[PDB]
Amino acid sequence: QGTVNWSVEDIVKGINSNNLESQLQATQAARKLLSREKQPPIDNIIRAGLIPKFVSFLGKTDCSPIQFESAWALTNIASGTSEQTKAVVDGGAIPAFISLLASPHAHISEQAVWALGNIAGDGSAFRDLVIKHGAIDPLLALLAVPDLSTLACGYLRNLTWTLSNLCRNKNPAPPLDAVEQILPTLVRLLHHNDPEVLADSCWAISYLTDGPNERIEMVVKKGVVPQLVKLLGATELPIVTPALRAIGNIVTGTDEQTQKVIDAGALAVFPSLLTNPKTNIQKEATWTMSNITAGRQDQIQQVVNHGLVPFLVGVLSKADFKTQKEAAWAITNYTSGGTVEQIVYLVHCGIIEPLMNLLSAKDTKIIQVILDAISNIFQAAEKLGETEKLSIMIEECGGLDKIEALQRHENESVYKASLNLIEKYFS
């Protein structure tokens, strides 16, 4: 092939030649420049004024090769900075790519899917603009087959990823009608057997559940929670990660939505998640637990029954610090909403020592959270006349020294809560 390593000037000469074949060769040359891994000359191509020509080439139904080459070139310009994606949009590329979704050539429709994904992937405005130009119908139409397994694998993965970008980003979140339009195809993809399709389908579900209760409800109503819990149990980390993010988002919703997570068996997975060697999995699983322990007493009881309190003591005892912070939150929520017996159970599991040990941390917020937890636990002891026995417990593990020291802490609410503890239980 003689389209390798052209200068931009030669590409321009060829595209401006009025010779469809010369234009094709020059466009292919541009594609090859633009697809090189080391510093593709995107800005030089834009500056040469080539985007309008590429976009025009997208419409050449009689020359499918130049449709393809221009589609690939524009895809890679659009894969760049916001300014570069904006140059592609400003050239009129969105409707041209949407028109290419119906190409009889799979490699060309796939390229148009990819390009629209990059454009939508830029942010809420371009996502919403792609939707307004009517991208969703033809995209969904590409997946309207009896069995996803008959579609080419790379093709399906590209469609799934682009759809996930139509679900992605907030301020604002995607249009409600668009989410409703996309969800049933999404649910179908979530039941597919390809790991990459599953991963990106969950990411899309996690985006859709990252919002107000009404947004969570739209997803939960589709009955996907059992499938999410199943994926929560996958051996493939790229699958577990978004399944866990989705589930965590869902339990930030109402008690009833959280209950749907519990009913589907999610808690049985947490012994592994809370000891997972991947730090982000542990952190997100602990975050998720904190939102479940902020729930009703019967839900806290579900946490107990599944044996998850010892795992919370574990994470509080030893974990990356951010995971420990989430654990501290899980404990404060638990002690806030729990029955006396549930709080007593917490203490019997050994929560006090690691909670005290974390009071030496240089983080003011976790200090507040822990002091709040200790206050709640003391309240339960008061309701059992056992504050003395708690005081002794705290003093024996060096907790009292730390609380006493916190009175000299510069943060107001800290030396207040601490002075109060000292003056109320350690006199």
Binding site: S35, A78, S79, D122, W161, R168, D200
Partner: peptide
């Protein structure tokens, strides 16, 4: 991070 990329470059094949 561990999320899908927002944009994808179709590299030299």
């Amino acid at each position: 991070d561990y999320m899908p990329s927002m944009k994808r470059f179709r590299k030299e094949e």
